[PDB]
Amino acid sequence: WRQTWSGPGTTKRFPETVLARCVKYTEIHPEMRHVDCQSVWDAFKGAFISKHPCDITEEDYQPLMKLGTQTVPCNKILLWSRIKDLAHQFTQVQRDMFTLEDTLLGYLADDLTWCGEFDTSKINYQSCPDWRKDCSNNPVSVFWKTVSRRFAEAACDVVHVMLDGSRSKIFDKDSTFGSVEVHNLQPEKVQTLEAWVIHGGREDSRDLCQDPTIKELESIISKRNIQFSCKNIYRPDKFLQCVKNPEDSSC
Numbered sequence: 001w002r003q004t005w006s007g008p009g010t011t012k013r014f015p016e017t018v019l020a021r022c023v024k025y026t027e028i029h030p031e032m033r034h035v036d037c038q039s040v041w042d043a044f045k046g047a048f049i050s051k052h053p054c055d056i057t058e059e060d061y062q063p064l065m066k067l068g069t070q071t072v073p074c075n076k077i078l079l080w081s082r083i084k085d086l087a088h089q090f091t092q093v094q095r096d097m098f099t100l101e102d103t104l105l106g107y108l109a110d111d112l113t114w115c116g117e118f119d120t121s122k123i124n125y126q127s128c129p130d131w132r133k134d135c136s137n138n139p140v141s142v143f144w145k146t147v148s149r150r151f152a153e154a155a156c157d158v159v160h161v162m163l164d165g166s167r168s169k170i171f172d173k174d175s176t177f178g179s180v181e182v183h184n185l186q187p188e189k190v191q192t193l194e195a196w197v198i199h200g201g202r203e204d205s206r207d208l209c210q211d212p213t214i215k216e217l218e219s220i221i222s223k224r225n226i227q228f229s230c231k232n233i234y235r236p237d238k239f240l241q242c243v244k245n246p247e248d249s250s251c
């Protein structure tokens with residue numbers, strides 16, 4: 001009648017879903033043919049089964065990271081913050097740019113929740129720790145931090161980030177982008193971080209590249225010895241029109 005934790009529990013059929021996603025990914029992407037999906041799942045399980053779900057570490061996920069090792073085109077990375085759908089829509093069409101969810105490990109875990117229980121092999125399908133209400137070192141949160149760091153470390157040249165220009169803080173220092181990814185871009189390899197600030201409906205005039213939180217991001221990035229650039233996407237529908245058909249003479 002009562003649940004242990006505040007967050008949603010493990011997604012139903014989690015084991016089968018992860019294995020099936022791995023099979024599909026490794027079928028489509030030829031460079032991942034070497035990957036044994038049962039081994040990936042065993043490694044994924046090993047990270048959190050029989051562990052207290054408030055005591056997960058990045059080391060727990062090391063076997064999975066090793067198996068899910070993947071070369072990503074370093075100059076074609078698209079980061080995003082609080083605007084998942086548009087970023088994915090974009091890379092679904094612009095297939096030569098890659099978000100974290102276009103990597104094997106991001107693909108496996110996208111939109112899923114999982115946790116175990118201490119001193120029993122059971123998956124908890126009733127509840128899982130909420131990052132804020134319960135604890136930060138939980139299976140889902142630790143996974144995303146670990147893979148997000150590794151993804152940001154892979155980037156080179158010009159790295160792009162899609163941001164939501166309709167939000168209160170367009171750049172949020174407390175988001176995963178702001179707290180993990182920005183600080184793990186390697187200054188030796190990354191020339192520029194270019195922000196694309198996506199405008200909300202019909203507000204097509206404000207230069208959001210002058211927003212205070214964008215100036216904050218600019219200052220943080222600049223002080224890491226990386227250049228900052230910013231572009232408004234004033235009218236998102238036209239942007240979508242043009243990505244989908246770039247030969248369109250209106251683009």
Ligand SMILES: *[C@H]1O[C@H](COP(=O)(O)OCCCC)[C@@H](O)[C@@H]1F
Pocket residue numbers: 078079080081082083100101148174175176177178181
């Ligand atoms: C790494 O993190 C980005 C998404 O995180 P957001 O910045 O969306 O943070 C989510 C949690 C907010 C409290 C994306 O580039 C990649 F997945």
